[PDB]
Amino acid sequence: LAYMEGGALRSMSDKALGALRLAVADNEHLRDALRLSEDPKRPERKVQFFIAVYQHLRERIRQDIIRTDDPVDAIEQMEIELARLTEELTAREQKLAI
Amino acid sequence: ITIDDAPYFSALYGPARHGIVVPDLSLVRPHLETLEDCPEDLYLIEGDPQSFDDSVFNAEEQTNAVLVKSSDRQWRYSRYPELPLFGRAARENRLEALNLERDALAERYATLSFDVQKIQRAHQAFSQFVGKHLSVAFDTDPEAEIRE
Amino acid sequence: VERDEVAAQKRELEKQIERLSQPSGAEDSRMIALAERFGGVLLSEIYDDITIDDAPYFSALYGPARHGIVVPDLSLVRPHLETLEDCPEDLYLIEGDPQSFDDSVFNAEEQTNAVLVKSSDRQWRYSRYPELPLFGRAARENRLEALNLERDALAERYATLSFDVQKIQRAHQAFSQFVGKHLSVAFDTDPEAEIRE
Amino acid sequence: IQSLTARAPVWLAAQDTLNQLCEQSGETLASSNDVTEYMQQLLEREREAT
Numbered sequence A: 001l002a003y004m005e006g007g008a009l010r011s012m013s014d015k016a017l018g019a020l021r022l023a024v025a026d027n028e029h030l031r032d033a034l035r036l037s038e039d040p041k042r043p044e045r046k047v048q049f050f051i052a053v054y055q056h057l058r059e060r061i062r063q064d065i066i067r068t069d070d071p072v073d074a075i076e077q078m079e080i081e082l083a084r085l086t087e088e089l090t091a092r093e094q095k096l097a098i
Numbered sequence B: 001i002t003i004d005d006a007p008y009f010s011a012l013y014g015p016a017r018h019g020i021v022v023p024d025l026s027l028v029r030p031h032l033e034t035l036e037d038c039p040e041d042l043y044l045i046e047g048d049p050q051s052f053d054d055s056v057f058n059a060e061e062q063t064n065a066v067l068v069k070s071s072d073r074q075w076r077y078s079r080y081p082e083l084p085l086f087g088r089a090a091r092e093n094r095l096e097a098l099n100l101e102r103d104a105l106a107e108r109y110a111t112l113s114f115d116v117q118k119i120q121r122a123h124q125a126f127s128q129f130v131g132k133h134l135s136v137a138f139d140t141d142p143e144a145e146i147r148e
Numbered sequence C: 001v002e003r004d005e006v007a008a009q010k011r012e013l014e015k016q017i018e019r020l021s022q023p024s025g026a027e028d029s030r031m032i033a034l035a036e037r038f039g040g041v042l043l044s045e046i047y048d049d050i051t052i053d054d055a056p057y058f059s060a061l062y063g064p065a066r067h068g069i070v071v072p073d074l075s076l077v078r079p080h081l082e083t084l085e086d087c088p089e090d091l092y093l094i095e096g097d098p099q100s101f102d103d104s105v106f107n108a109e110e111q112t113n114a115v116l117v118k119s120s121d122r123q124w125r126y127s128r129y130p131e132l133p134l135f136g137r138a139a140r141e142n143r144l145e146a147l148n149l150e151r152d153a154l155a156e157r158y159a160t161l162s163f164d165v166q167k168i169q170r171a172h173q174a175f176s177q178f179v180g181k182h183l184s185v186a187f188d189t190d191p192e193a194e195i196r197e
Numbered sequence D: 001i002q003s004l005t006a007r008a009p010v011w012l013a014a015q016d017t018l019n020q021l022c023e024q025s026g027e028t029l030a031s032s033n034d035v036t037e038y039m040q041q042l043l044e045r046e047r048e049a050t
Helices: A006-023 A029-037 A043-059 A071-097 B005-016 B028-034 B090-136 B142-147 C002-018 C029-037 C043-047 C054-066 C077-081 C138-181 C191-196 D002-024 D032-049
Strands: B041-045 B059-062 B065-071 B074-079 C090-094 C108-111 C114-120 C123-128
Touching: A006 A029, A029 A043, A043 A071, A071 B090, B005 B041, B005 B065, B005 B074, B005 C054, B005 C090, B028 C114, B065 C077, B065 C114, B074 C054, B074 C077, B090 D002, B090 D032, B142 D002, C002 C138, C043 C054, C054 C090, C054 C114, C054 C123, C138 D032
Parallel strands: none
Antiparallel strands: B041 C123, B059 B065, B065 B074, B074 C090, C108 C114, C114 C123
């Protein structure tokens, strides 16, 4: 993004923020951090928000069955879990029918 | 029947272990011609279903087995099977053990399927990449040049 | 992916064909060994050439007793009976002449594509006609040949797909070579006109 | 400088995409041919795993 004007950067930031609004609708701490982050006179807040995201994403890793500290690398583990749960659901359905 | 007598009785009854007790054998006589959808060898026994008296056999117990004369000039020698058909109380425990076994099979299969998915995803990412990316791949850094 | 799929199908066909161990389609070699250990002959071996029409009837009549050894003595078994552990759990033995094996004893009544036999007291057994019966095998070589044809068709399809993959790889390497050595000037104009100007 | 600048963003985005893609892998790529081989090992691993 080094070679694009501030206007486009602002526009895409606005769009990202609009998306984030819906994304974090549910959460309250992340929502509050976002609600704080938009003051133009406190830029570090935005950075803080990002930290709060990763930090948050880590606690809800549910490390009982997942290990990757980086949430980006935990997508594979969640996919594994979905596949396993689909198999388990099939088994449970068969058991219940019988 | 007990786990110990289950093998003995299973060997004693042989392919007839799974038979159905019908004291008449005449109810199936008319329907017999109709039976085209049935196990290749259906077994029926005659006696009281509630208190059936053990089928008379030309049995002869041997070490962990039972010889029997099924018909004139015909003997069937049933070795004591393990985890038999009769005694289907702990056999449910064995099919539970089968579930336990298949748990690991499912886990391994899930790992393999996930690996397949990851490889496919990586391949697709690389294909897309090259589609958009080859034109400037491994080309020189403009930044250093511009600084110079 | 498709050549690998054809390879997997050919693997399945090859597994099935290998499952046609002997003579053409596997027969229990353990039971042959038992018939060798006890004076007698395999029942199917005696009827392996019986007519195709009655072969399903014979199989239905015999039921599990289809696989049996024609031991006219029954005396080699009783001492060795306790000595038999590898033998099939429900081992079947019949007394008869292997050279001319008399028809086995059944109180048989023929139903439409089926049989009912008074197997024993209070025991009536009902059976149907099977396909590819234990008796009248005639080596059923044509089944083996059809399986071999399918395996060979799979191998041929795999070969064609492998050749196609090789051609595609060749084209890819040519394209990679081009973009590695002519990408920079690809599609660009002629410098001669500019030089002349 | 202007020509290099025009070229810059494309090259930079390409570099970043490649860095992400390779880092996602354990290997670091250095050539189109290298990428082609990595693809071949990928196919081999795929046809094995399947």
